[PDB]
Sequence to fold (325 residues):
Amino acid sequence: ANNVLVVGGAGFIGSHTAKLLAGQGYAPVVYDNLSTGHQSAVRWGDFVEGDILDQARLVETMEKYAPVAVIHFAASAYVGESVEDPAKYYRNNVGGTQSLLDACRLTRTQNVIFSSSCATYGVPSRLPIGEGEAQNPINPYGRTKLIAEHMLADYAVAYGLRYVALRYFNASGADIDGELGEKHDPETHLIPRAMMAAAGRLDVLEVYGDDYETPDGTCIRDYIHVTDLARAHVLAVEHLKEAGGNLAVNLGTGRGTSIREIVQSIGRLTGRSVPVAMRARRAGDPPALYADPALAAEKLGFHTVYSDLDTIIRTAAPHFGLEVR
Ligand SMILES: NC(=O)c1ccc[n+]([C@@H]2O[C@H](COP(=O)([O-])OP(=O)(O)OC[C@H]3O[C@@H](n4cnc5c(N)ncnc54)[C@H](O)[C@@H]3O)[C@@H](O)[C@H]2O)c1
Ligand SMILES: [Zn+2]
Fold:
């Protein structure tokens, strides 16, 4: 009917996507083990506490709700944690995804929207990064996201599963209306850390390098507003509903953002400066990484509409002890 199973739906991007689904008349059903997400963020439909590795419980859930699509956000997502603890990432991201895909095929639950990462590309050859770019990830996090992408392809071949894999770099901002935000502990993402530091919730923001080959010398990365991510994941649902073919596309603005720009923007919009501690650049670290969004525009009709820096900063700031002036 209109149930959409949002796996990992108690987390940052998943909860925003559940909110959006409900706005478009779907009934999001959240399946989440609350390991890093929050029960209080499940505000737009039913909640099933459970682990995606609990295959009986996941199958039971799919049988009860007969979802028209499954959106898979349920993963371990931290790069540095993945180098030191690869076990966690192979278990959650490869084992967990296989359990989810088995639950899907065994219940004839057909449409899977997979939240992937541009970390699958590793170091690229040209900028911006097109989907044709080789995928040579350089850490277990990127590795395990790539494995899930290929597992999706193999399950499509064998079982006729239909899917859209969505690749992006950095989820940012928060819901425009202010009641839903990014709550991680530890918080490892750049814009939240910079804001926490400006707010005095962190003492410093260590920034590694001011001598990159970039306009202001600080490194450039790719940021997309979480509401835009919600929009794309639901468009992906529509795509498969309308008998669309399997897809793997990048999500983003097509334009990068430097650390300096972010720090400057925060100081300007909140009146509080970020206490930056500039450290030596790490050798072999890329000056710029950002994705080519053209294919998503073509295949999904998707453009970002909330991912200007000012909107990202303005909507996130109130969640980290700052005020927009
Ligand atoms: N945040 C980003 O910048 C970013 C970038 C690229 C990709 N992604 C992908 O987005 C998805 C979630 O991102 P988030 O940033 O919202 O992280 P998040 O941790 O806020 O949400 C993750 C959710 O998954 C749940 N979960 C984790 N393992 C589970 C399991 N085994 N069984 C059931 N529930 C489980 C957690 O409790 C949490 O609610 C992940 O797939 C992540 O790789 C995020
Ligand atoms: Zn975070």
Residues 173-221+253-325 form a domain with the UDP-galactose 4-epimerase; domain 1 fold (CATH 3.90.25.10). The chain has two domains: 1-172+222-252, 173-221+253-325. The pocket of zinc ion (ligand 2) is lined by residues 182, 184, 187-189, 192 (CB under 6 Å). The first helix runs from residue 12 to 23.
